[PDB]
Amino acid sequence: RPFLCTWXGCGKRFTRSDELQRHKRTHTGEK
């Protein structure tokens, strides 16, 4: 399952959901 970040134009795709969760932390708040 392509765990793709759907924030704005930040279409970064991940292989593991933890990677996407980790990544999403960047958008969730200031840094």
Interaction of residue 5 with Zn ion, rule CB under 5 A:
yes
Query: With binding defined as CB under 5 A, does residue 4 bind Zn ion?
Result: no
User: By rule CB under 5 A, what count of residues binds Zn ion?
Assistant: 3
Residue 23: its H or E element: helix 17-27
On whether the CB atoms of residues 18 and 1 are closer than 8 A, the answer is: no
Residue 25 is a binding residue for Zn ion (CB under 5 A): no
What does R_g of the chain's alpha carbons equal in angstroms?
9
CB of 21 to Zn ion, least distance (A): 11
State the residues that interact with Zn ion by CB under 5 A.
5, 7, 10
